[PDB]
Enzyme design. Structure first.
Site, mmCIF file in Angstrom:
data_model
loop_
_atom_site.group_PDB
_atom_site.id
_atom_site.type_symbol
_atom_site.label_atom_id
_atom_site.label_comp_id
_atom_site.label_asym_id
_atom_site.label_seq_id
_atom_site.Cartn_x
_atom_site.Cartn_y
_atom_site.Cartn_z
ATOM 1 C CG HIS A 73 -5.881 -2.706 2.187
ATOM 2 N ND1 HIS A 73 -5.247 -2.315 1.019
ATOM 3 C CD2 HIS A 73 -5.284 -1.999 3.188
ATOM 4 C CE1 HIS A 73 -4.306 -1.424 1.302
ATOM 5 N NE2 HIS A 73 -4.304 -1.218 2.611
ATOM 6 C CB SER A 81 -1.064 -0.013 1.108
ATOM 7 O OG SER A 81 -0.589 0.539 2.317
ATOM 8 C CG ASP A 88 -6.891 -3.381 -2.578
ATOM 9 O OD1 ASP A 88 -7.469 -2.426 -2.021
ATOM 10 O OD2 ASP A 88 -5.685 -3.651 -2.392
#
Length: 260
Positions: free
Chosen positions: A226, A106, A199
């Protein structure tokens, strides 16, 4: 011929690092996704061959709708980059010989990607040929076509691509930075992209977000799917998970690296 052959850079996602953590023994956030890759590498390889470094950075994403005493996404991302390129710069001056392997999740993935973009376009901090390969997990900047599309990825693009126009977000401390200039450059063949079906960070449809609905937008942007890249539930390539795959990938890359 002097110091560690290959440096492996691991950049954790949001709420998975602090500036105070051990670069060589990430410990504060045991659940951190990138630990599932970096830890196994460290113990599987000698210090002469491989140094694994995980970025100690703030890794926060302030949301104005809660009273977060958090750092804004913008700076946080900014710090994480400063910290990482300086780590890369120093290891290069001490060891101009050393090759690199980069991986991020991320927030860390957008940082890692931005770096690849630069190296790929001769913008530094290192020369192209010294980077073995890059792997980005849940990259909010993902574009189809740029970088390698690994696995059962959805077609689509990162929230920072589809929300590039949206102005409030920027003012609010989290600018959606749009497409990476010049792509991953000469690194385009070695830069891998992993993204889970469902996602919203790296597979963002226009319909998913609204301005009329900004709290829920920030929640979604800041961070199950996630949560779970370490299960084969949504993304699996040939018998392993996103974590198992990217480990295998690197474990193998490190073997093949040159010996100075």
């Amino acid at each position: 011929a002097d110091c560690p052959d290959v440096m492996m850079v691991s950049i954790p996602g949001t709420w998975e690092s602090s500036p105070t953590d051990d670069p060589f023994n990430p410990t504060q956030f045991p659940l951190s996704l990138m630990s599932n890759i970096s830890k196994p590498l460290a113990e599987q390889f000698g210090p002469d061959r491989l140094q694994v470094y995980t970025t100690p950075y703030t890794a926060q994403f302030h949301n104005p709708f809660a009273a977060d005493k958090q750092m804004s996404y913008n700076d946080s991302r900014a710090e994480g980059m400063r910290t990482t390129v300086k780590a890369m710069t120093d290891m290069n001056d001490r060891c101009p010989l050393t090759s690199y392997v980069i991986a991020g999740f991320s927030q860390g993935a957008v940082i890692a990607g931005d770096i690849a973009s630069d190296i790929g376009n001769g913008r530094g901090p290192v020369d192209e040929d010294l980077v073995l390969g890059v792997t980005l997990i849940a990259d909010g900047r993902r574009q189809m076509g740029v970088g390698q599309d690994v696995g059962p990825n959805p077609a689509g693009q990162g929230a920072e691509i589809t929300l590039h126009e949206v102005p409030a977000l920027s003012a609010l401390g989290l600018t959606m930075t749009g497409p990476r200039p010049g792509g991953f450059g000469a690194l385009d063949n070695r830069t891998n992209q992993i993204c889970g079906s469902g996602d919203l960070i790296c597979s963002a449809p226009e319909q998913a977000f609204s301005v009329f609905n900004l709290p829920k937008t920030l929640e979604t942007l800041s961070g199950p799917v996630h949560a779970l890249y370490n299960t084969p539930q949504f993304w699996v390539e040939n018998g392993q998970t996103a974590t198992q795959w990217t480990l295998e990938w690197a474990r193998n890359l490190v073997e093949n690296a040159p010996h100075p």
